[PDB]
């Protein structure tokens, strides 16, 4: 029990929900965990693994990211800010990857999942890079039901922090692919209220947010603090009632606690 864990515990108690945190500091490879081995519903944070899996495929198919995918009216789901522009046309796997990562487009995610052979294709890729915890079971939008105690479409903070580190700072992907993933994450449009809200403004970062039922509010980030080695930080949050409201502020507070303890 560190000072940091006690602060996170205090935040959790006043939040009404359940908080999970995992930090890896690549300066010394030390970790700070809070409910690090408990499962949480990933919601849109799973888009990172799907995008990464497609990047892996592109290592042996040089033109893969230029491959077109048909977007049909029936394909549109519940949040399609990019796909809606291209219905009855096509989008490339690059376009879909960027839409999924940077705008959290749910139709684009479904296309990535299809390209991987279904949710289990995403899980297969996680296993291939050494993540024995991640599981993707469903497509969008039902992967966001986030029912307490449900193991579907979940991971642990420890596992996601490790995987994010290997994808963005390690060798799970080819160099070109790693760089592309980082570029996409740093270009995210959805993250300014979440982990990054709790960080010193001078720092740089990329992230992927997620939200769902049970007021589930998630963020996973790769962070470059001024003057030191990168960090990986995962903050997952979820609440007892199905119609609970989002709490990005809790994620920001978690990140602030983590930042002050560095
Ligand atoms: C018990 C504790 C925990 O996470 O183990 N906890 C919750 O589940 C929610 C509900 C129970 C206490 C508080 C409300 C919030 C919390 O910290
Ligand atoms: C795209 C995704 C996300 O968290 O990134 N997402 C939401 O933002 C919420 C609102 C938009 C669609 C639904 C409600 C739920 C969802 O799937
Ligand atoms: C949102 C924005 C736009 O033009 O309005 N946009 C892009 O920047 C590119 C990349 C990000 C999404 C897609 C690929 C395409 C797009 O629609």
Automatic annotation (TrEMBL):
Protein's name according to its UniProt entry: Beta-lactamase
NCBIfam families in the record: bla_class_A, blaCTX-M
Gene Ontology biological-process annotations: beta-lactam antibiotic catabolic process; response to antibiotic
Family: Belongs to the class-A beta-lactamase family.
The keyword Signal is annotated on this UniProt entry: yes
EC number: 3.5.2.6
Organism this protein belongs to: Escherichia coli
Keyword Methyltransferase annotated: no
Residue ranges constituting the Beta-lactamase class A catalytic domain according to the UniProt record: 20-235
Keywords of the record: Antibiotic resistance, Hydrolase, Plasmid, Pyrrolidone carboxylic acid, Signal
GO MF entry, a single one: beta-lactamase activity
Gene3D superfamilies linked to this entry: DD-peptidase/beta-lactamase superfamily (3.40.710.10)
Reaction(s) this enzyme catalyzes, per UniProt: a beta-lactam + H2O = a substituted beta-amino acid
